[PDB]
Structure formats: structure tokens, C-alpha cells
Amino acid sequence: INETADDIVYRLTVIIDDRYESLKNLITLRADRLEMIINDNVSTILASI
Amino acid sequence: NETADDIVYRLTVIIDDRYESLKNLITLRADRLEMIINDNVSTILASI
Amino acid sequence: INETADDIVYRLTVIIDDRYESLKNLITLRADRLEMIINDNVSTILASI
Amino acid sequence: NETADDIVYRLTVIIDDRYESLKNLITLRADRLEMIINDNVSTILASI
Ligand SMILES: c1cc2ccc3cccc4ccc(c1)c2c34
Ligand SMILES: c1cc2ccc3cccc4ccc(c1)c2c34
């Protein structure tokens, strides 16, 4: 039944890994954009005075 | 190996549910931070 | 072996649930603080002109 | 039920590892956003 155990762990590892990479990507996505937005607005505040 | 299938399935449902929840939360707070920032930028530019 | 299956799922559900609540708490923690920081700084920019 | 123990253990290690990684990332980006904000606040206040 060890091969079954191996398959159980492997299949859920793939699942866990996939959702992990997706959450990493999303966190990175929103953070990059928040930085962009902030740096853009700072340029306007300083641009207009 | 039907038992194996059910174990994987039951935990996949759990993993997927918590994943969708964390996604939703991240989107919620990021969207709000964007709104807040754009709001305050208007106030600063609106006050000179 | 169904009781074993049940125990496997339960034990990993507890684990998954715990790490979930922790990540939620952390996301909430940092977001609340970013909002606080932003709103504080806006008060200074507007306070000093 | 040693096989059961190893299944739980092996997946607990995986779950814990990805959890610590996501924590670290969240802390990394939040810390950086705080630094960026405090930096720009100084520039705006330093320019009038
Ligand atoms: C709760 C805790 C988690 C820890 C680590 C994870 C890694 C990848 C995807 C995940 C999805 C959902 C989780 C829920 C979670 C994940
Ligand atoms: C990208 C997305 C985020 C969503 C929610 C957050 C909550 C608190 C601090 C955060 C910092 C950085 C993020 C980047 C981010 C945060």
C-alpha cells in the first residue's frame, strides 16, 4: 500500500504547490502595482507642487 | 484505490476552498488600499 | 480502513485550517497597518501644507 | 497505521514549508511598501 501512499502525497503535493505558486503570483502582482501607483502619485503631488 | 481517491478529493476541496478565500482577501485589501491611496492623492492635490 | 482515511483527512484539515487562519490574520494585520500609515502621512502632508 | 502517519507527516512538511514561504513573502512586500511610503512622505514634505 506504500505505492498508494506515494500517490496520495504526490497528488496533493501537486495541488498544494499549484495553489502556492498562484498565491505568490497574486501577492507579487498586487504589490508591484501598489508600488507603481504610489510612485506615480508621488510624481503628481511633486509635479503640481 | 477508491479510498485513496476520496482522501485526495476531500483534501483537494479543503485546499481549494482556503485558496479561494485567501485570494479573495488579498484582492479585497489590495483593492481597498488602491482606493484609499487614490482618494488621499486627490485631497493633497485638492488642497494645493 | 475508512476510519484511517477519516483520521488522515481530519489531521491534515486541522493543519490546513490553522495555516489558513494564520495567513488571513497576517494579511489583515499588514493591511490595517498600511492603511493606518497612509492615513497618518496624509494628515501630515495636509497638516504642513 | 504507520503509513497513515507518514502520509500526514509528509504533507504537513509540505504545507508548513509553503506557509512559511507565503508568510515571508507577505512580510517582505508589506515591509517594502511601508518603506516606500515613508520615503515619499519625506520627499513631499521636503519639497514644501
Ligand atoms: C491554508 C494554509 C495554507 C498553507 C500553505 C499553502 C500553500 C499553497 C496553497 C495553499 C492553499 C490554501 C491554504 C490554506 C494553504 C496553502
Ligand atoms: C500585494 C497584495 C497585498 C494584499 C494584501 C496586503 C495586506 C497587507 C499588506 C500587504 C503588503 C503588500 C501586498 C502586496 C499586499 C498586502
Side-chain angles (χ1 to χ4, degrees), chain B residues 3 6-8 10-11 14-15 17-19 21-22 25-26 29 32-33 36-37 40 43-44 47, chain C residues 1 5-6 8-9 12-13 16-17 20 23-24 27-28 31-32 34-35 38-39 42 45-46:
Chain B
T3 176
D6 203 50
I7 292 176
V8 171
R10 293 168 67 190
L11 287 165
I14 291 157
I15 294 167
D17 181 86
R18 307 309 186 273
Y19 159 78
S21 183
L22 294 167
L25 182 61
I26 288 156
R29 302 312 303 269
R32 172 166 172 83
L33 283 167
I36 298 179
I37 292 173
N40 288 329
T43 302
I44 297 169
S47 306
Chain C
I1 100 201
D6 286 345
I8 289 175
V9 167
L12 288 165
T13 302
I16 297 169
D17 271 344
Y20 164 74
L23 290 168
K24 266 188 57 174
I27 290 160
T28 303
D32 293 359
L34 278 168
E35 291 187 20
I38 292 164
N39 289 322
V42 176
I45 299 163
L46 294 171

Side-chain angles (χ1 to χ4, degrees), chain D residues 28-44:
Chain D
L28 185 69
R29 302 312 303 269
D31 290 352
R32 172 166 172 83
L33 283 167
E34 283 184 35
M35 306 174 184
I36 298 179
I37 292 173
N38 294 323
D39 288 351
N40 288 329
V41 171
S42 298
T43 302
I44 297 169

Side-chain angles (χ1 to χ4, degrees), chain A residues 13 15-24, chain B residues 14-22, chain C residues 13 15-24, chain D residues 14-22:
Chain A
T13 302
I15 298 299
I16 297 169
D17 271 344
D18 179 85
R19 310 305 186 270
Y20 164 74
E21 290 290 341
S22 182
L23 290 168
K24 266 188 57 174
Chain B
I14 291 157
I15 294 167
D16 287 347
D17 181 86
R18 307 309 186 273
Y19 159 78
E20 287 293 336
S21 183
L22 294 167
Chain C
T13 302
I15 298 299
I16 297 169
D17 271 344
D18 179 85
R19 310 305 186 270
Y20 164 74
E21 290 290 341
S22 182
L23 290 168
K24 266 188 57 174
Chain D
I14 291 157
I15 294 167
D16 287 347
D17 181 86
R18 307 309 186 273
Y19 159 78
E20 287 293 336
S21 183
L22 294 167

Side-chain angles (χ1 to χ4, degrees), chain A residues 1 5-6 8-9 12-13 16-17 20 23-25 27-29 31-32 34-35 38-39 42 45-46, chain D residues 3 6-8 10-11 14-15 17-19 21-22 25-26 29 32-33 36-37 40-41 43-45 47:
Chain A
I1 100 201
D6 286 345
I8 289 175
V9 167
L12 288 165
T13 302
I16 297 169
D17 271 344
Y20 164 74
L23 290 168
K24 266 188 57 174
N25 182 99
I27 290 160
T28 303
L29 178 73
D32 293 359
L34 278 168
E35 291 187 20
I38 292 164
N39 289 322
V42 176
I45 299 163
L46 294 171
Chain D
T3 176
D6 203 50
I7 292 176
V8 171
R10 293 168 67 190
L11 287 165
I14 291 157
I15 294 167
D17 181 86
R18 307 309 186 273
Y19 159 78
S21 183
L22 294 167
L25 182 61
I26 288 156
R29 302 312 303 269
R32 172 166 172 83
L33 283 167
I36 298 179
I37 292 173
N40 288 329
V41 171
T43 302
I44 297 169
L45 272 39
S47 306

